[PDB]
Write a protein that binds this ligand. Sequence first.
Ligand SMILES: [Mg+2]
Ligand SMILES: [Mg+2]
Ligand SMILES: [Mg+2]
Ligand SMILES: [Mg+2]
Ligand SMILES: [Mg+2]
Lengths: 52, 114, 59, 148
Amino acid sequence: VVNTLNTNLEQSTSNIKNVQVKHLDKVSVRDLMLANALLVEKEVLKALEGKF
Amino acid sequence: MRIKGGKQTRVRRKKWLKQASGSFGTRHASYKVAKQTVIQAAKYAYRDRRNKKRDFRSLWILRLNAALREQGMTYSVFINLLKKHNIEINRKVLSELAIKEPSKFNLIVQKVKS
Amino acid sequence: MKVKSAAKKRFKLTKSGQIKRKHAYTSHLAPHKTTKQKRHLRKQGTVSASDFKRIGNLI
Amino acid sequence: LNQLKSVPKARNHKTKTLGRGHGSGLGKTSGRGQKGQKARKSGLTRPGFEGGQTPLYRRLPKFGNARKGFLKQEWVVLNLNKIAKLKLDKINRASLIEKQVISAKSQLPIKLIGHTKLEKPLHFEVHKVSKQALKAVENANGSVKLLE
RNA sequence: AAAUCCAGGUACGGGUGAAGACACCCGUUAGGCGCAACGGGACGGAAAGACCCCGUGAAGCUUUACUGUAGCUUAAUAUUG
RNA sequence: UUGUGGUAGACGAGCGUUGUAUUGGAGUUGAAGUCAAAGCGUGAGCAUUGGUGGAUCCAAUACAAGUGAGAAUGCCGGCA
RNA sequence: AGGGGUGAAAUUCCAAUCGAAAUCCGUGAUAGCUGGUUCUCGUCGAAAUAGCUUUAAGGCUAGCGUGAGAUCACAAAUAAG
RNA sequence: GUGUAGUGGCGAGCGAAAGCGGAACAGGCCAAACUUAUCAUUAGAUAGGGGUUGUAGGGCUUGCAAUGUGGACUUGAAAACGAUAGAAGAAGCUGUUGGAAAGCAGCGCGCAAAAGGGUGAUAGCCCCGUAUUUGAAAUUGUUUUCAUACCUAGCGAGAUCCCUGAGUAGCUCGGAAAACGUUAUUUUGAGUGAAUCUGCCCAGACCAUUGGGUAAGCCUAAAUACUAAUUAGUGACCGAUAGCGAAACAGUACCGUGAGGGAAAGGUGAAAAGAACCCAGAGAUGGGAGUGAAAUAGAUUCUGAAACCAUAUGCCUACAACGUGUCAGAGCACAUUAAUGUGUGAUGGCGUGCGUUUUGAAGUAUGAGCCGGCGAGUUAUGAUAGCAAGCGUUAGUUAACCAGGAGAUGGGGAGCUGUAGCGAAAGCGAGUUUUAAAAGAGCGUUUGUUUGUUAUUAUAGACCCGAAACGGGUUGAGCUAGUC
Ligand SMILES: [Mg+2]
Ligand SMILES: [Mg+2]
Ligand SMILES: [Mg+2]
Ligand SMILES: [Mg+2]
Ligand SMILES: [Mg+2]
């Protein structure tokens, strides 16, 4: 999960069928409770706390 | 979405047909007749599972009457001679089987003479 | 589901159910009835609970 | 929460399938009875119908609509039994827009109403005040201005 | 080839029965299986009874039944002095 | 302790099918389907072995339905 | 050439069909009327009456079934007085 | 907004216009006054200038400021981005079962490519592609830039000057569009018929006051509806009784004079290596051989149930009344999903099928010859009720629409329900209607909302099948009737 949507990252992991990168506003309940492992970037916490 | 399902129908009909084997003619071939005959057979099973204990008691009565009639008294008098005097709960079959192993039965029929 | 037009013009609906209605026998023949009957029928009244089902879904 | 096993608490109720045999009940007749008009396709005649007998609505006389062709002039209303729970002084449209009870795009006149006593003073700016509502507001050593 | 056909190993008398029975009840008679015949029965087969009745069913026809109308005729007005 | 016949009919709990989703997993050392067998269940239904067959499929929890056939002088095909 | 035709008149004939042809379309016409309506187990269990009905083979409401909830004592039953 | 105001044999039913939130947004030009040139100028006509309307405008007399935006738009030039063929386009070997391994297993490897298809069985690395980066002589599309025409520009002063769409607006008779079953408004087949800015029309018959707008002439992109077609692709869509009627030479064959009606059926194997040769036979064909993993894959060609027809071990049956089975039970013959076992069953007791509809059917009442397949309470949009969940006492809640992976969702408060009722209504207000009555009675003096799921219900064919028929368009006088 990313806030600024970096392009080096999503250039990778696109050929990987397992994994996927998403901007914060594009994670759903299913897309998140399916993760089973995730990597949050340190920024989005400030955003997330605001959204509750 | 479309569902055909020819497996389940054939399996069910196969069970019904397998129930009726040893049936005359087409009764074991066509399913429509096999189901009728299985239903009817189970009705007869339910009725006979009661009629047979209705009838076996009668048979025991008959083969006890015959045994007592060769000693000098009747079955309709023997039952008194079990209940009122020498109160016995000997069953109505075993007093029958005791003739097939006799001379232990004569002990009964002369015991109640007291 | 359109409200029956010839009903919404005869059954005003009050608070908490209790459909309201006017009484019949008040339009035509005065002398054949009595004064007691006439002033009993002027006052409006509720609908019997038997017809409440037929009318509530009719509105 | 393990989509491989996702469960509710209770919402999956007895689905009355009407035409799939007798063991489930609701079978060949399917609950439609035996051989009536309702049994056939599209029974259930017109909602208000007593079958020839003049129906209740036809039997009863019609309510009269005096002010014909008009619409009742709506009022925005400020009852006193609840407005105490609302914390505000100097009541008017300019603040009722802020407290969201009224809307800015609403050129609608304001009425005041209600008998219940209120503790603190409130200064209302409204179009109509009841006699005893005005009395109640003034006993709280407040005021009411009646806009014209 | 055909129409027919719930499965059939498909007797008779008296009685009973949704009221006239191959099967039910109580008696009676009868080895298994064909072939040529004949038609009593299986309320045989072919036809969702043509008669009768019912449906707020159809169509055709009638008339001083109702409502309308093509036509025929009469008057005002325009064409027009 | 009191009960447990039952059409119309109300109510409850359930089996099976087809597919989607994620989770486990079996398969040319032979998958489904198909027949056969002297199994297991309170029922819908479910396994085990073998012959055939020659590539997909099974279980658990949800979800969605062209979802469950003995009758319609039913339709189509076959056969008496 | 069909709410027409033709008729030495019979309701004749109009492509094996004619009290108003044939096929296509509105059209999946409508049918209070027949027939059919597909898996299981458990719990409970009726009516076939009254009133009205251009209604009487149908319909509405009451009566009788079931499910959810309250009334739990003065309500409802069963015996004696 | 609302299923509202209304309209309706006030029955069935029908159903707006405002207002509000939004997608998109542009408004231009003639006729006539006046003037010009010419028509035997009897013009009342032809071609120009000029001018376009409402806080009224324009023309007529007189001045100031203007050189410019602007497009509903003409020709050229240049450029960009596309459409129509295509080019490059990374990475693997070993072992076992095996007919063939690409599986399984060992050790690696590449990635802006683990979308897809084929390759003897399931491949990221065998191939063809894909991601990516690219490229057009010729034809074509959209946009942009520069020049290029035609159209287009503003603030004042004077005064009874003139113009401002005639068989027109109205009025009457018959009808209709509009939500309205004829009614303001709008249209018209017949008849009549005005006025000219102190004007004309309008604000549900009508008049006055107030206020709004200027008909009777023309033109107009955008948002909107639809997709047989071209290209790329998708599917909790069908998978040969399905799905288009049609997977194949299907609107074919076939029926009918004609309009018109109108089908069924596909799969060898990885590859023909399509089965040379031999025996029987006239021959098809069959049986060996041969190829092949298998010929029980053989051209009848994937699998190959059932009804159905034949063969056979085991048991029973030729004095026996039978809805054909069941409960007992001998003898006989075998031996299992190891079980108080299996197949048959001389002989005793007992025994009038299944659905349907009916007061009641074994029924001399009806449906089904048998097997297999197909086949009948769903869906959209709203109403009420039950259950569960979120949110809550000035609460709850979004619709359209916009951005988005043909997504959850974010924005979007316009509206919806509830928060005060009563009354026919103005109105009053925890009270209110009736009433002289402040008595009495009626009704009220708080228990929400949005979704999920289920039952019932409404409008749509609304469980399925079933008419005789009704109306509209066409095709038929090659038989038959008449006439020529
Ligand atoms: Mg029926
Ligand atoms: Mg006959
Ligand atoms: Mg007015
Ligand atoms: Mg049935
Ligand atoms: Mg008959």
